[PDB]
Write an enzyme that holds these catalytic residues in place. Structure first.
Site, PDB file in Angstrom:
ATOM      1  N   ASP A   1     -99.048   7.292  78.252  1.00 42.72           N
ATOM      2  CA  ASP A   1     -98.552   6.512  77.118  1.00 42.72           C
ATOM      3  C   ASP A   1     -99.415   5.239  76.901  1.00 42.72           C
ATOM      4  O   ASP A   1     -98.896   3.981  76.714  1.00 42.72           O
ATOM      5  CB  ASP A   1     -97.092   6.505  77.467  1.00 42.72           C
ATOM      6  CG  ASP A   1     -95.986   6.684  76.256  1.00 42.72           C
ATOM      7  OD1 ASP A   1     -96.674   6.540  75.046  1.00 42.72           O
ATOM      8  OD2 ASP A   1     -94.733   6.554  76.476  1.00 42.72           O
TER       9      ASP A   1
ATOM     10  N   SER B   1    -100.196   0.319  72.074  1.00 46.04           N
ATOM     11  CA  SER B   1     -99.967  -1.356  72.015  1.00 46.04           C
ATOM     12  C   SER B   1     -98.908  -1.782  72.558  1.00 46.04           C
ATOM     13  O   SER B   1     -98.894  -2.800  73.170  1.00 46.04           O
ATOM     14  CB  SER B   1    -100.276  -1.508  70.494  1.00 46.04           C
ATOM     15  OG  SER B   1     -99.383  -1.198  69.598  1.00 46.04           O
TER      16      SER B   1
END
Ligand SMILES: CN(C)[C@H]1CC[C@H](Nc2ncnc3[nH]cc([C@H]4CC[C@H](C(N)=O)CC4)c23)CC1
Length: 279
Positions: free
Chosen positions: A139, A142
């Site tokens: 995963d 940002s």
């Protein structure tokens, strides 16, 4: 090892798990599908307390964090298992997530190109540590790259991390490699996700925007390659120090990570080398 915190201690340091936002004088930092994140104060020090709301992702976080200690990974201080609820205690990241800083959430100043290059290098050093230690994050995005007092990148959320195919397909679709979407578990999928992060850093655009054309940021690679648009057209305008050459050197790294064929993508060590040569 980690510290075993009592639930009562965690309750009084988070002001009885105050769900009112920090912005109005509460303790809530943000919520996700697996819990609420609260700001706390233990040993005068500020901490982040994730009160979970599942037990597998709790144990997977503790397992991976016990093994993985690096300059570019968030540090877990401890947990609470005894009391009505499970909590995870981390070192506090005063500059939040890369996602929030790129969107200038809550009126924070735009990140300079110089800060953005360091963050890219840092996040890559973190991914390389994970891959050297035979872990796939699954995963990379940002929202999972946190920022300390010196804006040093710290990879977070090892709940879906794995030491290959699966039925339980997980991750964020806007950042996922084509083979990850099909069910393959491979460190090459983390490289693809990092390419999307590099695009977010160059452009300041979120990976997905349902009210934008193209909706997915990874689609700009196609626009640039098919000379419909330029990388210069996409560069974040909220910067005064973005040098054309180094922006082009970062876009080349991003373009390489976004190769649709996993074997044509560079490995994380090549990514670090490329980001180093850029500065
Ligand atoms: C939208 N936005 C406001 C977000 C809200 C959450 C914030 N989280 C943090 N803030 C400051 N210090 C921190 N240290 C550690 C973390 C996180 C806590 C949650 C963990 C998890 N497994 O979900 C990962 C690590 C953290 C980041 C910003």
């Amino acid at each position: 090892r980690f510290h075993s915190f009592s639930f009562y201690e965690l309750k009084n340091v988070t002001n009885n798990f105050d769900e009112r936002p920090i912005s109005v004088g509460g303790n809530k930092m943000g919520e996700g599908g697996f819990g609420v994140v609260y700001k706390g104060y233990v040993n005068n020090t500020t901490v982040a307390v994730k009160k979970l709301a599942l037990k597998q992702q709790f144990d997977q976080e503790i397992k991976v964090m016990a093994k993985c200690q690096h300059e570019n990974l968030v540090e877990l201080l401890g947990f609470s298992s005894d009391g009505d609820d499970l909590c995870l205690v981390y070192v506090y990241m005063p500059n939040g997530s890369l996602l929030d800083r790129l969107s200038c959430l809550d009126g924070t100043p735009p990140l300079s190109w110089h800060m953005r290059c360091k963050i890219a290098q840092g996040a890559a050093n973190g991914i390389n540590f994970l891959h050297e230690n035979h872990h796939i994050h699954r995963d990379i995005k940002s929202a999972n790259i946190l920022l300390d007092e010196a804006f040093t990148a710290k990879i977070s959320d090892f709940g879906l991390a794995r030491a290959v195919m699966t039925s339980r397909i997980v991750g964020t679709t806007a950042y996922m490699a084509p083979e990850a979407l099909r069910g393959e578990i491979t460190p090459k999928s983390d490289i693809y996700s990092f390419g999307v992060v590099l695009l977010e850093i160059i452009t300041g655009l979120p990976a997905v925007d349902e009210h934008r054309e193209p909706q997915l940021l990874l689609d700009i690679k196609e626009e640039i390659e098919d000379e419909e648009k330029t990388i210069e057209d996409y560069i974040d305008k909220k910067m005064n120090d973005a040098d054309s050459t180094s922006v082009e050197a970062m876009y080349s790294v991003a373009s390489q990570c976004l190769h649709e064929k996993k074997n044509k993508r560079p490995d994380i060590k090549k990514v670090q080398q490329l980001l180093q040569e850029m500065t």
